[PDB]
Amino acid sequence: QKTLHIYNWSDYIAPDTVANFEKETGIKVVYDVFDSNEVLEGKLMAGSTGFDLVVPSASFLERQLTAGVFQPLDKSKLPEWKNLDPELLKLVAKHDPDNKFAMPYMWATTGIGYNVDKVKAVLGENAPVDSWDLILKPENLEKLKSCGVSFLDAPEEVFATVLNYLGKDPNSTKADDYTGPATDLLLKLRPNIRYFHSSQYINDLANGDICVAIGWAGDVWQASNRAKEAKNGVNVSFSIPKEGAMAFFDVFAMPADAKNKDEAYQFLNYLLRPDVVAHISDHVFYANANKAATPLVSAEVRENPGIYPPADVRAKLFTLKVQDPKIDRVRTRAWTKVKSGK
Ligand SMILES: COCCOC[C@H](C)N
Numbered sequence: 001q002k003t004l005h006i007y008n009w010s011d012y013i014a015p016d017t018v019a020n021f022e023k024e025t026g027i028k029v030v031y032d033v034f035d036s037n038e039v040l041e042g043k044l045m046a047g048s049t050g051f052d053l054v055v056p057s058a059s060f061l062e063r064q065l066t067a068g069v070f071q072p073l074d075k076s077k078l079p080e081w082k083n084l085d086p087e088l089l090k091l092v093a094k095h096d097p098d099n100k101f102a103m104p105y106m107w108a109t110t111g112i113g114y115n116v117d118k119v120k121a122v123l124g125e126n127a128p129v130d131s132w133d134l135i136l137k138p139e140n141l142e143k144l145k146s147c148g149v150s151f152l153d154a155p156e157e158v159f160a161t162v163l164n165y166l167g168k169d170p171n172s173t174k175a176d177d178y179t180g181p182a183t184d185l186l187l188k189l190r191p192n193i194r195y196f197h198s199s200q201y202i203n204d205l206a207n208g209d210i211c212v213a214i215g216w217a218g219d220v221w222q223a224s225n226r227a228k229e230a231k232n233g234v235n236v237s238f239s240i241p242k243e244g245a246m247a248f249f250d251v252f253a254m255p256a257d258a259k260n261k262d263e264a265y266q267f268l269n270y271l272l273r274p275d276v277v278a279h280i281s282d283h284v285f286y287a288n289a290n291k292a293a294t295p296l297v298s299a300e301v302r303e304n305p306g307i308y309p310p311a312d313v314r315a316k317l318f319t320l321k322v323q324d325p326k327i328d329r330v331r332t333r334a335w336t337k338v339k340s341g342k
């Protein structure tokens with residue numbers, strides 16, 4: 001009687017997905033969650049994770065492959081692979097050549113989640129919720145402090161967002177861009193930021209405890225739905241700002257030392273079933289990478305342009321690149337200064 005150990009992002013599966021898989025297959029699943037690519041990457045680089053499946057963002061998987069931490073997926077054990085969208089596979093192949101190691105799961109953008117009524121109360125009806133100006137102009141963030149501001153604890157995404165806002169290459173390789181203008185701006189914003197955290201902002205948005213967050217799209221749409229279901233009067237929305245935003249692709253991968261590989265393939269093939277992954281998207285408010293599943297996704301999710309954005313929005317999205325030791329050094333040092341004080 002076998003087990004399967006899965007490590008996924010929090011708030012990233014439907015409530016019954018695992019139970020349904022267990023009932024079908026007789027496999028027992030141990031399911032654990034993270035909210036940080038850095039936490040997962042540290043575990044993968046430090047030794048064995050004790051997991052059979054993990055879910056990095058593809059930009060992080062790109063560098064993890066060169067450490068040999070994953071094993072290549074045997075496509076013969078993944079007959080439902082045919083359901084994946086060829087255009088999304090090509091994009092993920094920029095990180096995972098020939099799609100050898102990674103199964104695309106969900107994708108979205110890093111944008112602005114906000115309480116509609118509170119932001120308009122503070123910055124007026126014409127609050128610039130369509131722009132990173134809302135939170136990256138110090139004068140706006142000084143006012144939004146009154147109702148609470150969170151940033152993601154995600155250094156690579158935050159710096160790339162700030163760099164793009166400043167008109168630099170989002171993946172600048174100029175150290176001075178990080179130590180100079182990006183740091184200078186973030187240090188002006190810091191006094192007005194309540195916390196840096198990549199998951200507490202969901203319930204804090206939903207409950208009205210913060211009014212603006214840098215957030216991942218589906219997380220914010222979940223906060224909006226939780227508030228609606230609580231009938232608490234809180235109106236949360238999400239914006240892909242006009243200056244552009246980072247897109248990401250989260251992907252399942254199999255550690256090279258996975259104990260229960262056959263069971264891991266069974267779960268991957270299960271997630272590739274159109275009705276399974278559409279049901280997930282319906283609950284987590286993220287676009288999946290399964291073309292066959294799209295018609296089965298609820299209209300509420302499929303028709304939301306902050307989840308399944310149209311081509312003209314997609315054209316303004318950017319993706320992360322791998323950096324060298326120097327940039328990693330200067331960026332991480334700068335991030336520690338920005339978060340200083342807790
Ligand atoms: C169906 O294509 C999805 C595209 O994702 C966004 C990229 C950055 N253009």
Ligand SMILES: [Cl-]
Pocket residue numbers: 297298299300
């Ligand atoms: Cl529907």
